[PDB]
């Protein structure tokens, strides 16, 4: 029956929601269900053909004030349901992509639809437009854990050689350790090169 593929798709939605919600990291979101979506869209096209057939046959006039009213209303509701299921799935994966944008890309691509890939590009362009405009003195893409300590120990987890910072350098020797201003290394903690606190 016409609601079923929508239910399969939103059960998929719920499972990917749980997959994302169980962990602190961004779990790489699962494959876009192109096949179920195409089955739904074909089902919607069939329901559209049924409305077309019926609105043709209202010229022929069979009991239309009730019977055609009922057939039309039911198939219309089937289409509303299928729209709701499709938009619920797409809105969840949109929400997760927005989260990933702010977490990393605004500072696994095969699993997205091409609309979702170019959407993620445009949304990263938007985040960068915000932190590049007014309010620029705040790195709007930065962390939301409050700054507890200004100086921190950090252990170098992967090697990256000599890099400059605002008034000096760090030579990121493997398994060396710094005592350093947190604001001068936060980018490297996010990028996974530095370990502690």
């Amino acid at each position: 029956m016409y609601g079923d593929l929508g239910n399969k798709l939103v059960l998929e939605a719920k499972r990917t929601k749980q997959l994302y919600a169980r962990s602190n990291q961004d779990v790489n979101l699962p494959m876009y269900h192109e096949d179920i979506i195409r089955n739904i869209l074909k089902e919607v096209s069939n329901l559209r053909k049924n409305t077309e057939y019926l609105k043709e046959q209202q010229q022929l006039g069979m009991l239309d004030d009730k019977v055609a009213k009922c057939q039309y209303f039911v198939t219309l509701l089937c289409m509303e349901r299928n729209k709701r299921c499709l938009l619920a799935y797409q809105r969840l994966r949109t929400d997760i992509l927005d989260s990933m944008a702010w977490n990393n890309n605004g500072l696994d691509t095969n699993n997205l639809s091409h609309q979702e890939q170019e959407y993620l590009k445009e949304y990263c362009d938007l985040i960068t437009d915000l932190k590049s405009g007014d309010l620029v003195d705040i790195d709007l893409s930065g962390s939301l854990v409050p700054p507890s300590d200004v100086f921190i120990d950090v252990r170098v987890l992967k090697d990256a050689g000599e890099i400059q910072t605002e008034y000096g350098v760090f030579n990121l020797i493997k398994d060396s350790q710094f005592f350093v201003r947190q604001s001068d290394v936060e980018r490297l903690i996010q990028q996974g090169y530095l370990q502690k606190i």
Partner: protein, 243 residues
């Protein structure tokens, strides 16, 4: 004895950056916990961003003066101050951007509704107006090409209010929130019109839960879990604040 405390008061009587930071803290705390998107403090945020810019330039200038008496400790306090302050602004803005994500269609409805007593440019920042417009356009393009291209003309609208389920999500106005009953921002309990005496002669505000047709006395200096709509104007006037 003859009381003289007023005589002594009339003899004794003979903006600030700290208040701005306190107002920012109040705005952040109220924003985080409320269901509604609260109106943006335009002037306060202009002043705060100016101070962050100037204080950063100051810390730069002193660092150059060190590079080109020499106690580092006040510079450390200045640096971690700007880090803490920038965190508050970051958390505040990111929070209300999330609210704009939730209520993008409702905010569009407030923009479209010519009869509205709220204009979107009262409620949102310039940057939030930009974000709302272009995020709405980009998400709408995504779902148009992906999904709504294939629906009939009955159903291509993304803000359908008449369907079997309403597409426009709005704030849960009667959502429960914790509040602390400040009383008026001045100490002048005599000047507040809504303030009144409770039993035992302690001040309060009475508010009516409209669904239940029940009055409740929000006594000053005590904490309540309340429907947000029921307290909304007391919150607008700072008579209560969200914990």
């Amino acid at each position: 004895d003859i009381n003289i405390d007023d005589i002594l008061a009339e003899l004794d009587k003979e903006v600030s950056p700290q208040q701005d930071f306190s107002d920012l803290m109040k705005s952040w705390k109220n924003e985080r916990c409320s269901p509604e998107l609260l109106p943006y403090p335009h002037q306060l945020m202009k002043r705060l961003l100016n101070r962050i810019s100037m204080q950063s330039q100051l810390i730069e200038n002193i660092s150059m003066g060190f590079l080109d008496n020499e106690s580092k400790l006040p510079l450390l306090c200045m640096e971690t101050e700007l880090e803490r302050l920038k965190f508050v602004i970051r958390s505040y803005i990111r929070c209300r951007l999330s609210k704009i994500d939730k209520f993008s269609l409702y905010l569009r409805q407030l923009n479209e509704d010519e009869n509205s007593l709220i204009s979107l440019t009262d409620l949102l920042s310039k940057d939030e107006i930009k974000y709302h417009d272009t995020h709405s356009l980009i998400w709408l393009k995504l779902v148009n090409d992906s999904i709504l291209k294939y629906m009939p003309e009955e159903l291509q609208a993304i803000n359908d209010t008449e369907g079997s389920v309403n597409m426009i999500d709005e704030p849960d106005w009667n959502k429960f929130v914790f509040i602390h009953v400040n009383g008026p921002p001045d100490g002048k309990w005599n000047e507040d019109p809504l303030l009144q005496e409770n039993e035992f002669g302690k001040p309060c505000y009475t508010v009516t839960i409209p669904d239940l047709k029940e009055e409740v006395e929000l006594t000053i200096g005590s904490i309540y879990v309340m429907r947000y709509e029921v307290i909304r104007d007391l919150l607008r006037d700072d008579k209560v604040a969200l914990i």
